[PDB]
Design a protein around this nucleic acid. Structure first.
Length: 83
RNA sequence: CAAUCGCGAGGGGCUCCAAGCGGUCGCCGGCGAGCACCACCCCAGCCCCGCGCCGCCCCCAGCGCACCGCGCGCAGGGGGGCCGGCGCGGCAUCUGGGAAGACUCCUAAGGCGCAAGGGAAUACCCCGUGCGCCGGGGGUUGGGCUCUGUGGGUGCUUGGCCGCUGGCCAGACCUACUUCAAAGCCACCGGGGGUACCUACCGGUUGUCUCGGUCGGGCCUCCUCUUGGGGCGCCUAGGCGGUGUCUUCGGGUCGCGUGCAGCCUCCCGUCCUCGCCU
RNA sequence: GGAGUAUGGUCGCAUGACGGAAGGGCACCACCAGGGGUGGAGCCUGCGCGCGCGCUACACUGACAGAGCCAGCGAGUACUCCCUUGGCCGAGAGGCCCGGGUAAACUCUGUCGUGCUGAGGAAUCCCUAG
RNA sequence: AGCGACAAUACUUCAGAGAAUCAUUUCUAUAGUAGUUGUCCUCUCUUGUGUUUCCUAAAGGAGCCACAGAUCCCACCCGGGUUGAUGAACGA
């Protein structure tokens, strides 16, 4: 729950001035630009990953057609030459 | 309360009425409290007294208005009546407030504080967890929690020990004596499966050499694990804490300009939302 | 080459039946006790002017006015009833501002006093503890 | 409709090579390869295992009476204390 009563440890603290205030503000603004930065970079690595697995799926379809044509022509060959 | 007595607003011609209000004698009336209406101090107020300002009224004291007049609009000198208010200073008392004595008052048998938790009339307030502080009650030359030890008890009471019909609790003696091995049965390994070697059992074979067989076992194999399960993590919608901008308004501020208009760096709060923390 | 499994064309074929008695059991399509409808008026969906069914209206249980006091289901960046006389900002299209059309109940306490301000024929139908 | 063919057209399915190591309480068939020893002294990291304990975090007490001991706490008193007790992050 949110606390509506300012406790003593909140009524006790040190109000901090301009130098450390601006060190806090600069440090926050850097951290937000880092978070949006890595959100972009991993969005684009995810997209390129999806293209990679897509075309790997198509090339394994063609590998399956090599399997079926090769085994079918085989059992033509020995399938005829056993009789 | 009971007997009694007085005055007299207010109204009407020394008299009349009355709202009211008091006194005296009895109270085999009842209630309440007794230093203290005091001590110490502070803040005011009533009154009386001091000294100086104003507020007002004075008298002399000059221009314009009527050169057929007073007085008037006003500039203000110096003193006066020193009249009252106000200001300041005491003021033996009286009045009120606060403080106040530790017998007193100290809100009650309970209260207070700090820190957390929950709810709001969201400035205030309210309710009952952890730490403390006092109090009431009770209270025999100390008390209390906790832990540990020993003895008895938690089933009806007949001795300690031995080579026990006897002996010993200080022990003693130590090694004999012998005619005749044995009756059988039974005897817990998880399931399926393999069988070369060992073993078991069955049937043998020659002369103690081998062979064949069998719901046993040794040995081997694959199940007797991988769960309608639990724990600990990861991930994450989100919440909270710390915290930072953005909008909006109100203040505050360094400074510039013309110190108008404004510009203008910085600070605080509100509104508003978004954000970030190994 | 085999095996299937499909797909689409081509061809041939023509021991019974019916009752009666008496005895059991059950029923708001029965008796019994009651309660509720619908059917009088109006609006109406439906079904075939008619039959209904839902809803509205009609008083003692009134009307007015205060005070008090109670629910449970309900959460998709979702939800607004109209259509406008005007005016703003509008070169133009729109957005604006101003006018027109968490309960009922219940409790308790006080003011008026039946005052077109009248509860529905025959019938047939339903209903037995939250 | 229903069977039979009677051919076509699709789909699906019907092999597995090479090399090495492992294993027979020596030797998996290979001589093309560590590894025939009861070493001495320390330190560090690390897998398990027993017991005891605490937490996650509760639960249940083989229970009674007597006597005794101990740590701790409170009370009293003593000692040092506003000529400074206690708390409390150091520049010479």
């Amino acid at each position: 729950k949110p606390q509506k009563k300012e406790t003593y440890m909140q009524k006790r603290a040190v109000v901090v001035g301009r130098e450390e205030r601006k060190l806090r503000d600069l440090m926050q603004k850097l951290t937000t630009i880092r978070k949006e930065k890595i959100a972009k970079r991993k969005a684009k690595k995810e997209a390129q990953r999806e293209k990679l697995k897509k075309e790997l799926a198509e090339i394994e379809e063609r590998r399956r057609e090599k399997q079926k044509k090769e085994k079918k022509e085989f059992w033509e060959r020995e399938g005829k030459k056993r009789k």
